[PDB]
Amino acid sequence: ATAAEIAALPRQKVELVDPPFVHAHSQVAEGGPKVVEFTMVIEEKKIVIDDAGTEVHAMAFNGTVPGPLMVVHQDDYLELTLINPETNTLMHNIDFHAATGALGGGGLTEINPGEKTILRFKATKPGVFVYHCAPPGMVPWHVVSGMNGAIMVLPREGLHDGKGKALTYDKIYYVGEQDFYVPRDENGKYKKYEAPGDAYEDTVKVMRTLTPTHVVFNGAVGALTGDKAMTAAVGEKVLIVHSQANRDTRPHLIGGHGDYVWATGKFNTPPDVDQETWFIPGGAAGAAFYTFQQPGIYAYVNHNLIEAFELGAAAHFKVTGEWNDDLMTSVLAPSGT
Amino acid sequence: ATAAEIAALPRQKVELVDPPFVHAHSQVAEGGPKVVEFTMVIEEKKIVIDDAGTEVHAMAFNGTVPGPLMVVHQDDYLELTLINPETNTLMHNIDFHAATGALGGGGLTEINPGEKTILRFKATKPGVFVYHCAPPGMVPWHVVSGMNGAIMVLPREGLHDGKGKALTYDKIYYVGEQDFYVPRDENGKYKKYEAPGDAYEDTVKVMRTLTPTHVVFNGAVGALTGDKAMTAAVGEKVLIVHSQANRDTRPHLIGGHGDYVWATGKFNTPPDVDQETWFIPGGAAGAAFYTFQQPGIYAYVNHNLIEAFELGAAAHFKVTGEWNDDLMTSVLAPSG
Amino acid sequence: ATAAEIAALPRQKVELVDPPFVHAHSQVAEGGPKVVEFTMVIEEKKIVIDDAGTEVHAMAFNGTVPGPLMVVHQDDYLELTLINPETNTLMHNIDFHAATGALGGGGLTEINPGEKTILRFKATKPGVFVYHCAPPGMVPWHVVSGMNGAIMVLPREGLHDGKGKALTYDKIYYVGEQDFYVPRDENGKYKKYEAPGDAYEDTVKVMRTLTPTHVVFNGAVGALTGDKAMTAAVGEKVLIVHSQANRDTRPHLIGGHGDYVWATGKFNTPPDVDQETWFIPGGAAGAAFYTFQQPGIYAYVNHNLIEAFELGAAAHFKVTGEWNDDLMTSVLAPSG
Numbered sequence A: 001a002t003a004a005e006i007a008a009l010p011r012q013k014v015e016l017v018d019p020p021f022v023h024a025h026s027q028v029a030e031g032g033p034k035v036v037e038f039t040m041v042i043e044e045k046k047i048v049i050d051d052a053g054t055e056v057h058a059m060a061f062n063g064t065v066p067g068p069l070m071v072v073h074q075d076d077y078l079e080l081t082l083i084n085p086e087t088n089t090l091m092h093n094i095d096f097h098a099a100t101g102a103l104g105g106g107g108l109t110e111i112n113p114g115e116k117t118i119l120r121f122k123a124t125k126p127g128v129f130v131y132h133c134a135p136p137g138m139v140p141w142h143v144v145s146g147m148n149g150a151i152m153v154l155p156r157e158g159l160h161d162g163k164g165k166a167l168t169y170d171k172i173y174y175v176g177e178q179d180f181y182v183p184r185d186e187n188g189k190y191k192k193y194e195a196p197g198d199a200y201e202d203t204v205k206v207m208r209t210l211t212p213t214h215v216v217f218n219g220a221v222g223a224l225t226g227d228k229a230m231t232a233a234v235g236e237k238v239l240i241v242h243s244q245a246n247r248d249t250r251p252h253l254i255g256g257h258g259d260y261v262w263a264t265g266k267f268n269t270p271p272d273v274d275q276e277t278w279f280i281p282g283g284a285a286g287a288a289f290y291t292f293q294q295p296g297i298y299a300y301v302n303h304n305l306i307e308a309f310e311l312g313a314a315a316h317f318k319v320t321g322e323w324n325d326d327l328m329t330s331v332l333a334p335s336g337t
Numbered sequence B, C: 001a002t003a004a005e006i007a008a009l010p011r012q013k014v015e016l017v018d019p020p021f022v023h024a025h026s027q028v029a030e031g032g033p034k035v036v037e038f039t040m041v042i043e044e045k046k047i048v049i050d051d052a053g054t055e056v057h058a059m060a061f062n063g064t065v066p067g068p069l070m071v072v073h074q075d076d077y078l079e080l081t082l083i084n085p086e087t088n089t090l091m092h093n094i095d096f097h098a099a100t101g102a103l104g105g106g107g108l109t110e111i112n113p114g115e116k117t118i119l120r121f122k123a124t125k126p127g128v129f130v131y132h133c134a135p136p137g138m139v140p141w142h143v144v145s146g147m148n149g150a151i152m153v154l155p156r157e158g159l160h161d162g163k164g165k166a167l168t169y170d171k172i173y174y175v176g177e178q179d180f181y182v183p184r185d186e187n188g189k190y191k192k193y194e195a196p197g198d199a200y201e202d203t204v205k206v207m208r209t210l211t212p213t214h215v216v217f218n219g220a221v222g223a224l225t226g227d228k229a230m231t232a233a234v235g236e237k238v239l240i241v242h243s244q245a246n247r248d249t250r251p252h253l254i255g256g257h258g259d260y261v262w263a264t265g266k267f268n269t270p271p272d273v274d275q276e277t278w279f280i281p282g283g284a285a286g287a288a289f290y291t292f293q294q295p296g297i298y299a300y301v302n303h304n305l306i307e308a309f310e311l312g313a314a315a316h317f318k319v320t321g322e323w324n325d326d327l328m329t330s331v332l333a334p335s336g
């Protein structure tokens, strides 16, 4: 409860890491409640989102789309220092869906260029939750320009299945999915602009059609493919956290499953099990736990397969280990009749 | 129950109230099963849905979009008197998703202007449920002209959580979300018409694109804001009923949560807890229970934020009470 | 188990039947795990999908859209022989969402015209699951040309509710829902093409709008209406399996409910109960169990009612039996 009991608590300062990785943390909390401190700087910057060179003026927490994942435990305090550099042109703020009051923090964190603010909130509910910018009057425009991310509030006793058995992951990846709305010219070619403000009117027109031009993971088409594929091994337990701040998605691991899936993202609601394809509504984050049982390349997609393979929403996993013929085998390889 | 057994049950006549409020009712049922009687009159009327003076020909149960919320308990009988006055132009009917048989009542309730009908059904399943008009051959046009609402069938023992603990609300509000499809002319200006039937063909062309021109709560952009903001106080338990008869939605209370959410709307399915944003498919109602912990303005939105802030799907709650600094505080206010 | 153990299991050859019917099977497994063998031939062929003569070049497992339902039990092996005749023009393969490894089998089953392959996988998780074609670089085009179906892996002890009570169905139907994307010329008329390849660029342009031109059950508008309505009787318990390989759907039985709904399709996740409309994400299958209480015609729809009644997503059930006036009755029939 009290203002002094809080200044009494230990403080841990965390250095953030760029998605899809997640900063070091412990699944089971060591000791009691803490004040966990994070800093993010906002950057307005041009990013290229496909191999054709399509540009968007992104508005990026910590310079990445999505913003990085913050991890705390239930009843810790999260204290954010948020900095809007004077090289930026717009006001920004932050709404944590994990927080209670003042529009998730948004009403207390409106910062013009050259301003900074420090917000603290108590993480009362365990789960993964979206955060995003929401300035009055231009809420969707900052969100669909990339200004969103997620946090994970772990139970103090770590994750468990619906029946109290402990679930401990070997590694965690954070996939942020972003719908972008890029205006086109009369030839069907994407338009380029000087500053974020100049793109505004044309972009609202595309937003009103409710049809994105690109739906991407980690800020671009093919961002998490090739040398940037996520990795695991046979027998490894992986937690994949996925967020979408504006639009629904339906994740699926091609060649795998979600063994336990908190599709709602909230760890006091028991997980669905054995899932093929799960559903995360726009404005939420979800998490899926899987133990890999076969080696090779997997794709991780939004299973509207037009959004995956035409609009960009596909990533890869490269998994090392030995093949299990009991689980699957080619009895007759492709061969002439 | 035999027809005799039904005839000896007490009857109770209910007066409906306009959304987002709900008629008086008790959470735990007082006594045994009843026949609960309601009457609705259908009104075809022009509504203006945004601040640019855009019009829809609404087809409104009891004259509101959405129609009003009706509340019974499990195993009561709902008896509806439905009237289509002679001032209307179209046939109408009603399909209750809570009812069993005859297309939810649609096949027994077809009434032309100048006609009335009385339908009775047993509310066998507890939950919130959509109702809507559905005349053969013109089903989606009546629904997306606002002819839909919801009913709530409470368990006889009131609401409970996953583990049988009782959940009693202080306040209930009913938010009906409506997708509208208004035709535009050559210069992108919304068209006006002089009778509902004149708008039919142009409207169908817009509907087949699957993209609404407006998505609103309580029948208009800004309906539940400012002045018509829903109110509560810190510490009050509030049940928010939300329906969408045609298209998906994903409600979210900005600055709060759904502490218990029956996202499917059905009270025998245990609620999800601690939700940030929940999902109601088109054709269903859902309900979220929350205890307010901070004062101030909250927005309640469909969290496709283009639908909320560009197309109209946003409401406000104004909440009185004292600020809790343990839950949230400004450590350093915006500064140089 | 050992290698000699696997090699020694009994084999059972099953003859498939076209949707919405399902091959004979037992709910409770008889005896121990088996290797269940199925054969499907792929057919590329023009089909007419609406009453205006609109044609699509379908890519059809076993000649139907959707492909047929295959039923095995948990820890059986499914062994599929897949044949791509030399009269087709494209390479195809198959991804089973129920399988583990090699992109669901897609990496091991790429067959050119004139080739066959045999894949075996162990069905380790119980549920209904989508299967579909997925050739690298052309995945959505084969899926939205109809090249998808579902399998059901039953628990060895048959279905049960959340409380472990047995659920035994009398009839099972499979409804496959398909989104099609058919190009139009500048006059608004649907285009026709000589070969499947000729339609590819124009179809991808429509696909990128994310808006189907048609959403159908069993491969055409009205395929499951009229004399092809699905049938049941009052008191029969029906399982309805529904799949959508690419796009979300929200099924609803108009006049009925889903008494138990595995909306995720996975039988180790307890079913939701008393559902009015449930929600199946694109890329999944779901299953709903209902006991019919009232006779008459029911419609079974995607409850975006524009998709149901303008774009094709509506089926009928015809149910025989005696009317139950306790559940529903017309107290006063429509009158002046």
Ligand SMILES: O=N[O-]
Pocket: A252, A253, A254, A255, A301, A303, A305, C095, C097, C104, C134
């Ligand atoms: O199984 N992914 O299409």
Ligand SMILES: O=N[O-]
Pocket: A095, A097, A104, A134, B252, B253, B254, B255, B303, B305
């Ligand atoms: O948290 N509202 O976007």
Ligand SMILES: O=N[O-]
Pocket: B095, B097, B104, B134, C252, C253, C254, C255, C301, C303, C305
């Ligand atoms: O109740 N079906 O619209």
Ligand SMILES: [Cu+2]
Pocket: A059, A091, A092, A093, A133, A134, A135, A142, A147
């Ligand atoms: Cu911003």
Ligand SMILES: [Cu+2]
Pocket: A095, A097, A132, A283, B252, B254, B303
């Ligand atoms: Cu939000």
Ligand SMILES: [Cu+2]
Pocket: B059, B091, B092, B093, B133, B134, B135, B142, B147
């Ligand atoms: Cu009507």
Ligand SMILES: [Cu+2]
Pocket: B095, B097, B132, B283, C252, C254, C303
């Ligand atoms: Cu309906």
Ligand SMILES: [Cu+2]
Pocket: C059, C091, C092, C093, C133, C134, C135, C142, C147
């Ligand atoms: Cu194919």
Ligand SMILES: [Cu+2]
Pocket: A252, A303, C095, C097, C132, C283
């Ligand atoms: Cu798939």
